[PDB]
RNA sequence: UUGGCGGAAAGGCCUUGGGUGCUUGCUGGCGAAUUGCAAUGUCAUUUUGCGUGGGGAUAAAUCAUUUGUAUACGACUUAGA
RNA sequence: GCGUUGGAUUGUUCACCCACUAAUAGGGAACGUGAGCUGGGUUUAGACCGUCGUGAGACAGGUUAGUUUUACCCUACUGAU
RNA sequence: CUAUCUAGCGAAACCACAGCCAAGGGAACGGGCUUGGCAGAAUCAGCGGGGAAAGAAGACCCUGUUGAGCUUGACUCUAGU
RNA sequence: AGAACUGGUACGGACAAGGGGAAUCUGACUGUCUAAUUAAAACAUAGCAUUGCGAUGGUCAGAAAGUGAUGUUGACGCAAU
RNA sequence: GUGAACAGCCUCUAGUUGAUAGAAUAAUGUAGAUAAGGGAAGUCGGCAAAAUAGAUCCGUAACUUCGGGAUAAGGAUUGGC
RNA sequence: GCCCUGAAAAUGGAUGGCGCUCAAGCGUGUUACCUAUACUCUACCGUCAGGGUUGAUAUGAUGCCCUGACGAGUAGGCAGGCGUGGAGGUCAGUGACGAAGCCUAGACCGUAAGGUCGGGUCGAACGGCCUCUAGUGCAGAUCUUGGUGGUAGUAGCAAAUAUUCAAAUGAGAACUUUGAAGACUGAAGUGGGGAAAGGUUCCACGUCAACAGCAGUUGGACGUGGGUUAGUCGAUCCUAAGA
RNA sequence: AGAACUGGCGAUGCGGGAUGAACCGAACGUAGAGUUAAGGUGCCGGAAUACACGCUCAUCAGACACCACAAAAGGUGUUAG
RNA sequence: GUCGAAUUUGGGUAUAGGGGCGAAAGACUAAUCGAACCAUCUAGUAGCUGGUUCCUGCCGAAGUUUCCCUCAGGAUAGCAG
RNA sequence: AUAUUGGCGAGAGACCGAUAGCGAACAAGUACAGUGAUGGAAAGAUGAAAAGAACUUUGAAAAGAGAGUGAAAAAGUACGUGAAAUUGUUGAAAGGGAAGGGCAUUUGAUCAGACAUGG
């Protein structure tokens, strides 16, 4: 408990977390935003296709030097990619949430992702050896991911 | 600081920037001065460049070591089926330039052209000029009005024509559409000619004739990203140079403190627009003619098509223009053949040619025979046959 | 509503014929206050979301796949019911 | 506006000859231009000589050998979305 | 084989603040100031003009009542003989 | 070692594997050194020459010594240039 | 096995198949090749490259410390049966 | 006198720019107009000066009140104050019904150093006034120690010829195991043993958080165990330079 | 580069000289109203495209102290003497 | 380049810092050499370089004299509180 | 009678308060480095009490979501408070080669000062 800022009816909502996960903070940020406010199954379906290389994740912030793809066109963008490890972890969290929702008997068909937020876990430090007898840091930038699914309210 | 020796700059700054052309169909940017005293006629034509071959002819040029003597010249052949007229566009003069006021189109358009208006034909509903057509319903007015508007205002008049690309070996089904200025006389006469030709066909032999000098307009063959050396013809640096030697060593003096628009740099080479002038017509082919490729000296029955077929193109089954020398663009590419913006009197330009012989051996290797008939005569019987 | 004219960016102009309101050309009958000695007191035109009733019309582009006249990647050019 | 060169000797700039040519003008751009090159000369440390000095050493004298680092950032410039 | 594009992995240098010019004056060569030219999101590959780019409180020079290695009939001594 | 025959005249068929000549400067040669900018014409060298010494000695060591190197030596030797 | 061979090249026994991977094939590179005609005109300088090369038989200058120089130079030959 | 010739330099460019020709140019005259932290008059802050006033009569005599003049500032001198750790004294000070601390384009006082309040968070101690005392106030010192960025998902992860099909196992297989194929080291070995050195890395079972700069079910890794058998092989004995 | 007297800059903002340590004006608590300085008043820009007599036409006019240079010498240009 | 000897090399042993060792380069003596490494004397000295921490109020400089192995420093007088 | 930065036993401080105080408040002369002489750190704080999260559900697992314990989980053996740099998400706003600042006012947001006169 204690997620970031949410403004959603907790009674119509369910949520999931993952902490100290060894995936790229920057890549997974980019992909969390890719499905933000999405209806869960659209999200689910799309992420499955990004694995299949049929659509992609737009890279909007952590993105300089990244190649260009025709697949960014959809999202008005030139620079997108296919972050498998990120997609994969986000899927696990979506899956969990979805489980938690069923347990609360929320309507699977009304569910959209109402909150999704990656921030930065503590780094994991390894060493690289460099020319002239030096050492440099070779680190991991792990992620904390949290998200929330909620029932869309009706007319 | 005063460059030690002097040399001319590499490359022409009048052909910048050296980028990819906007369209693959290079634009006609000038049509000939109009002489409104003579029959309404097209001022250019559209074709597909098919390949090159070789000619022999006597030269006619008093005072040349080669007068009254055979010379042998490269030619290029461009596949030139008839062009169909499907619209007229009228232009007015303004203090801001020529401007189009309307376009009036033909009642019926073929799929070939209609296809040019779509990116996904297979799955479109092909609604292209379907409401426009109905403008013909009414005994005329809507159409007849706009024709009248072009007569009243309108200062220059172009027809819209397209290629019949299906009459051509090309895989491409989408035809090429273009405006061509009508130079024959009188604005009113122009639009009538145009009206009368809607949906009708126009052949090259009504535009161009033997001995004529004509211009070619075409996008040049692409080559992708080039280095400085081949892109600009900059000089190789010595073998000894560190970090590579296809460069220019000095990109600039210290001031102006900015690399300047005139130094040579790597980037795109090819796929540029070129208007190439002064290409003499050496043949106007008839497609119905089974002796296309023959001469009053070489009496044999043969078509212009090489043994084996034009490499990377196929056969020539239509009217065609044969032009001396060479032309920008590559095989398969659309070319606009434009008439001269001027009255050349060159002597070279006035000469009337007559071919004596047209090469027809295979261009797919060192071909030794002009016709299947000649080959069999030479080789005698094989193990296939009979 | 009858004719016409206007392409320089015409998108406006002139015209014919009635209908309808007003008419301070002129002569009457009423009304106005207390908004209190000025202060906030005439409504203009832009977009944009919705509301009703009528007329109307009934596509494509992109990804993926494909060509190689194109190409570092994007991009270009082809093909696919 | 447009050109203004090919060589022999010298690290040379300069100089000087040969030779071609329409002509072989003169200069600037941090004495343009070394994360562009080269490293022949200068100008570290090895070394021979001549002059100088008791000597260590010295020489605007001769001679030989002597490691040429980094761009992935901004801008400019070339091209590309 | 690289570069390039993709998945995984993922450093460093450097950083007053920053980053389009012309002229002016100015610590006598401006990204900033003054007057003008101008000026349109977000970007990719290349590039070596500029950032008087970056790497060791300048190798040369001078100053200091700062040294050390070395030499000698400088000054003052000393093992030895 | 010889001879005949044979082939698109090829045949040390891949692999393997000295370019040569005429000279000038310089060091005789083989050898040696600046590990990480100098391999050289610098150092060595054999050869030549000079110097000291007969042991109570020459040359050198040690603070001193019943102390030490040459010396398991003796001038065809040891020591110093 | 080839061959003069503990060379190079291919093999048996034994041992490996481990040193991120996928898709492309721009510039510029790094490493490997080739170029018509000319032949050092390039350059401080033939730097780099190229050319020679095994064996058999012929032949082989000046000079010399008489040992050399010398694979001097220059030529013919080379498979298979 | 004005004007013209005399009058040649390097990025494109400067009467400041536009542009101006009975001027918006040059000489001269006459009015009006614009505008400085200056001048004039007034309010307020402070500084300095002069003067009045506890004579009995509530609350500051280093006070209250009246009057005139004055205000630039580096190095630097002096003054009056703001704030911190601790100390004597005092408010019989605040506090678990919430001390201290922290957060807050909320509020109020002060020219300022600062002080005060609300709200949030928090959890055990703390403050005002008169004094005393100093290890007492940071932006810098290529300052010290720590922590963090842009750079950047960038440079890169290209030497050592080379991999492929299938099955098995597994949550998961480009990378494990088995099979097949293709290849390499080529006995001057990528074969089989040792010396120095390491010290358990050897073998088995289990097993993947970290480590093996992709991965991992694999390992020289992690956990738990097992394992080195001498009259004849060494040391041990001998002597060497020498100690 | 070096002296004399004074005034400045340095230590100093403000208004003018586009810009600018030092020129012109004027020195500075917080403000209100008025007036000016030096300098300006076509437009940029607050302020007469004011008034008056002349002079000047430049195929290189000219335009304001310090100040961002110009001379000898010439003109049948035009002015007045 | 050399490649059967002034050859290459293991281990053992000896030489220690104004000392060693040097076919001699001021070379080498544990990434250290024109005097190694370690600790202490030591917070070595510095006329030189850098930095030196709250506010406001008042006053407010000097770059000159004389003397100094004085000339990037002091003392002295002046200016200032 | 005098000395006493050592040893043993004690009483103290206007001393320091975990970057301070001895190098060491801790398995500190430790871990680690170096052939060697020597060099030599970092590192304290859940809660009164482990009551250290039974059980259910998703997952290969780590974990998540519930539940539960507790005065509190805004204390979960990453643990008291939990600043800054720097970061994610949400909300508002601006943005033609930097951004930030001054005087002034428009517009939007936000906050005030009132306080009393017969019914």
Swiss-Prot record, chain A:
One of its GO terms (cellular component) is cytosolic large ribosomal subunit. The keyword Transmembrane does not apply. Its main location: cytoplasm. GO terms for biological process: cleavage in ITS2 between 5.8S rRNA and LSU-rRNA of tricistronic rRNA transcript (SSU-rRNA, 5.8S rRNA, LSU-rRNA); cytoplasmic translation. The modification Phosphothreonine is found at residue 69. GO terms for molecular function: structural constituent of ribosome. Keywords: Cytoplasm, Isopeptide bond, Phosphoprotein, Ribonucleoprotein, Ribosomal protein, Ubl conjugation. It is found in: Cytoplasm. There is a cross-link at residue 45 (Glycyl lysine isopeptide (Lys-Gly) (interchain with G-Cter in ubiquitin)). The keyword Plastid does not apply. Belongs to the universal ribosomal protein uL22 family. Component of the large ribosomal subunit (LSU). Mature yeast ribosomes consist of a small (40S) and a large (60S) subunit. The 40S small subunit contains 1 molecule of ribosomal RNA (18S rRNA) and 33 different proteins (encoded by 57 genes). The large 60S subunit contains 3 rRNA molecules (25S, 5.8S and 5S rRNA) and 46 different proteins (encoded by 81 genes). uL22 is associated with the polypeptide exit tunnel. Component of the ribosome, a large ribonucleoprotein complex responsible for the synthesis of proteins in the cell. The small ribosomal subunit (SSU) binds messenger RNAs (mRNAs) and translates the encoded message by selecting cognate aminoacyl-transfer RNA (tRNA) molecules. The large subunit (LSU) contains the ribosomal catalytic site termed the peptidyl transferase center (PTC), which catalyzes the formation of peptide bonds, thereby polymerizing the amino acids delivered by tRNAs into a polypeptide chain. There are 2 genes for uL22 in yeast. This is Large ribosomal subunit protein uL22A. The lineage of its organism: Eukaryota, Fungi, Dikarya, Ascomycota, Saccharomycotina. The gene is RPL17A. The chain holds residues 2 to 156 of 184 of the full protein.
Swiss-Prot record, chain B:
Pfam families: Ribosomal_L3. Keywords: Cytoplasm, Isopeptide bond, Methylation, Phosphoprotein, Ribonucleoprotein, Ribosomal protein, Ubl conjugation. Changing residue 242 to A: Cells accumulate 35S and 23S pre-rRNA precursors. Cells display defects in translation elongation resulting in decreased translational accuracy. The modification Phosphoserine is found at residues 23, 155, 296. Disruption phenotype: A mutant confers resistance to trichodermin, a trichotecene toxin produced by plant-pathogenic fungi. PROSITE patterns: RIBOSOMAL_L3. The modification Pros-methylhistidine is found at residue 242. SUPFAM superfamilies: Translation proteins. One of its GO terms (biological process) is ribosomal large subunit assembly. InterPro entries: L3_arc_euk (IPR045077), Ribosomal_L3_dom_3_arc_sf (IPR044892), Ribosomal_uL3 (IPR000597), Ribosomal_uL3_CS (IPR019926), Transl_B-barrel_sf (IPR009000). Methylation at His-242 by HPM1 is required for proper 60S subunit assembly and promotes translational elongation fidelity. It is found in: Cytoplasm. The modification Phosphothreonine is found at residue 102. GO terms for molecular function: RNA binding; structural constituent of ribosome. There is a cross-link at residues 38, 135 (Glycyl lysine isopeptide (Lys-Gly) (interchain with G-Cter in ubiquitin)). The keyword DNA repair does not apply. One of its GO terms (cellular component) is cytoplasm. It comes from the Eukaryota. Component of the large ribosomal subunit (LSU). Mature yeast ribosomes consist of a small (40S) and a large (60S) subunit. The 40S small subunit contains 1 molecule of ribosomal RNA (18S rRNA) and 33 different proteins (encoded by 57 genes). The large 60S subunit contains 3 rRNA molecules (25S, 5.8S and 5S rRNA) and 46 different proteins (encoded by 81 genes). uL3 forms together with ES39L one of the contact sites for the signal recognition particle that targets ribosomes to the endoplasmic reticulum membrane. Component of the ribosome, a large ribonucleoprotein complex responsible for the synthesis of proteins in the cell. The small ribosomal subunit (SSU) binds messenger RNAs (mRNAs) and translates the encoded message by selecting cognate aminoacyl-transfer RNA (tRNA) molecules. The large subunit (LSU) contains the ribosomal catalytic site termed the peptidyl transferase center (PTC), which catalyzes the formation of peptide bonds, thereby polymerizing the amino acids delivered by tRNAs into a polypeptide chain. Present with 450 molecules/cell in log phase SD medium. This is Large ribosomal subunit protein uL3. It comes from Saccharomyces cerevisiae (strain ATCC 204508 / S288c).
